[PDB]
């Protein structure tokens, strides 16, 4: 029943503390098993290796925005740019309010080396950023098919400029919090990025 | 100063870069840097005390090819403080794609260098560096406003952060997926885009 299947969520949670205190590079399954109070067998039962766990920390970040995201990417949503505003606000709200989001992000950006002894962390990350880029592009097009964003704007590049700016901000708040009142000014910070996409001639063809 | 220790100093740094690049900054002992560099261990000890001193010196190295433009841009008597900043950003990107040395230290710094509350000096240094860099963009952005090169009521402080986030994230995306961003081919567009956001965006005002 309810045992074997709930251990999974207890393994992930211990994997987070372990990763947070020690770092991905130097943590081993064994470290996580002791923390979870299970055996390395219980772990191997849900996770073939340490890259799956990491992967699972990463795939957990998408859940809260899922719907707002899917909306932005829908060709039938009359407010696609407005949907991308609500998502960015939620990404930044979730970041400031949820200890758990803050720490998975803090693990991904500042613990977590790409080493060649375990290169699926890197491959997993590349691939994750491609799929997020493709999402942004469609949203970008959808707003353009709609008078919300300048016609024949460069999707691709705007997509990358947008990612760059948000990744870099998140990582910056993650380094210096008291230096960005990210919560008190979510609106300003989001629209700065929005203003770029819609006002930058360099982002045009 | 002494001519032997210089080459000696130079020979440890260079091999730290090679060493963090393969093994990363968490699982690399100053002893690895030994057998790789050649130099006897205790000298690596005369030279640097731990990891935070050495990692620090990789960062310190990065800044240098950009000294002149960055302090030009920051000078209050500089007639074109946005001009310098434009070129600076060009050099930075140009140097990233070209100089194998620069692309590597950046990879180390972004991708191979964990923060643990056990390796506090790595984080502490990082924080400090960004605050310094931050202190520069703001002065320059303030000199460009004054010159009437950036909108009048520009929020310099928020603006520097905005700019800072966009470049750091662009560098990292390029490291992560170079074949995605023709950083070298479209280099002018990438700079201008970030500059456009400083000048055009309403939200960065006041
Ligand atoms: O722009 C973003 C998210 C930006 C972002 C990427 C990574 C991250 O860590 C935080 C925020 C975005 C999507 O992703 C999906 C969408 O349908 C619309 C949309 O606007
Ligand atoms: O996967 C990432 C981080 C991407 C990234 C990792 C390393 C790097 O160097 C640059 C970018 C991520 C989040 O964290 C949060 C999101 O809502 C979406 C999202 O895609
Ligand atoms: O924007 C930057 C550097 C950004 C940056 C460079 C290298 C790097 O590795 C990461 C970020 C900058 C300064 O710092 C100081 C200035 O007076 C002007 C200026 O334009």
Curated annotation (Swiss-Prot), chain B:
Induction: Induced 4- to 8-fold in the presence of toluene; this is controlled by TtgX, a possible efflux pump global regulator. Induced by chloramphenicol and probably by tetracycline.
Keyword Phosphoprotein: no
Claim: Nucleotide-binding is one of the keywords in the record: no
Domain HTH tetR-type residue range list: 6-66
SUPFAM superfamilies according to UniProt: Homeodomain-like (SSF46689), Tetracyclin repressor-like, C-terminal domain (SSF48498)
Single Gene Ontology MF annotation: transcription cis-regulatory region binding
GO CC terms in record: protein-DNA complex
Alphabetically ordered keywords of this record: DNA-binding, Repressor, Transcription, Transcription regulation
Residues in the DNA-binding region annotation: 29-48
Matching PANTHER family: HTH-TYPE TRANSCRIPTIONAL REGULATOR ACRR, HTH-TYPE TRANSCRIPTIONAL REGULATOR RUTR
Biological function: Represses expression from the ttgABC operon promoter and its own expression. Binds to a promoter region between the divergently transcribed ttgR and ttgABC genes/operons; in the presence of chloramphenicol or tetracycline this binding no longer occurs and ttgR and ttgABC are derepressed. This suggests that TtgR binds these antibiotics.
Protein's name according to its UniProt entry: HTH-type transcriptional regulator TtgR
Organism name: Pseudomonas putida (strain DOT-T1E)
């Amino acid at each position: 029943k309810e045992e074997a299947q709930e251990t999974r969520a207890q393994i992930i949670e211990a994997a987070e503390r372990a990763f947070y205190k020690r770092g991905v590079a130097r943590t081993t399954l064994a470290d996580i098993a002791e923390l979870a109070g299970v055996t390395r067998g219980a772990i191997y039962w849900h996770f073939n290796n340490k890259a799956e766990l990491v992967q699972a920390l990463l795939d957990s970040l998408h859940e809260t925005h899922d719907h707002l995201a899917r909306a932005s990417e829908s060709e039938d949503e009359v407010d696609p740019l407005g949907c991308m505003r609500k998502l960015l606000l939620q990404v930044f709200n979730e970041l400031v309010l949820d200890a758990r989001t803050r720490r998975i992000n803090e693990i991904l950006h500042h613990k977590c080396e790409f080493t060649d002894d375990m290169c699926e962390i890197r491959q997993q990350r590349q691939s994750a950023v491609l799929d997020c880029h493709k999402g942004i592009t469609l949203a970008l097009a959808n707003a353009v098919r709609r008078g919300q964003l300048p016609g024949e704007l460069d999707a691709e590049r705007a997509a990358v400029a947008m990612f760059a700016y948000v990744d870099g901000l998140i990582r910056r708040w993650l380094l210096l919090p008291d230096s960005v009142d990210l919560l008190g000014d979510v609106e300003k910070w989001v629209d700065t990025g929005l203003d770029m996409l819609r006002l930058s001639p360099a982002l045009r063809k």
